[PDB]
Ligand binder design. Structure first.
Ligand code: A1BQ2
Ligand code: ZN
Length: 140
């Protein structure tokens, strides 16, 4: 589990969005596993605007914060889960790290702010859905 809170926006894994998030839907993309909903209160998270490939992510399955190098976002074939059939996921960044399904929503951060959230993993990899291209998140 986990969310990004910036202005009056909540960013979650699409597969972990609630009844309430769909009712308050701003924007979603199945191929990115991203959903954004409106909030009452103002969030305190800053979105990174950069092309950083180094950072730190939270791993709930280890209660630890791991420093990693990650690839630039791309279209990547991802195997089936509970939530999606085997498919191509877009805007996905991979790193060498431990992850399990419940680690989804863990935040990846660089010196500039929040980069993305855990979405994919296994075989010693972790996949992050990038949010740095969603410039509209910093306004309105
Ligand atoms: C970080 N992590 N996430 C999942 C997962 O099932 N994601 C569901 C969402 C999804 C995206 O594309 C297909 N399914 C996973 C599975 C084994 C090990 C680590 C893992
Ligand atoms: Zn950065």
């Amino acid at each position: 589990s986990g969310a990004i809170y910036v202005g009056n926006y909540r960013v979650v894994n699409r597969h972990l969005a609630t009844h309430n998030d769909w009712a308050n839907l701003v924007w979603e993309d199945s191929s990115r596993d991203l959903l954004v909903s409106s909030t009452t209160a103002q969030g305190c998270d800053t979105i990174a605007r950069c092309d950083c490939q180094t950072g730190v992510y939270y791993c709930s399955s280890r209660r630890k914060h791991y420093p990693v190098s990650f690839s630039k976002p791309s279209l990547i074939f991802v195997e089936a889960s509970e939530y999606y059939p085997a498919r191509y996921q877009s805007h996905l960044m991979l790193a060498v790290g431990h992850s399990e399904p419940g680690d989804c929503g863990g935040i990846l951060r660089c010196q500039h702010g929040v980069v993305g959230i855990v979405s994919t993993g296994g075989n010693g990899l972790v996949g992050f859905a990038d949010v740095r291209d969603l410039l509209w998140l910093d306004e309105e």
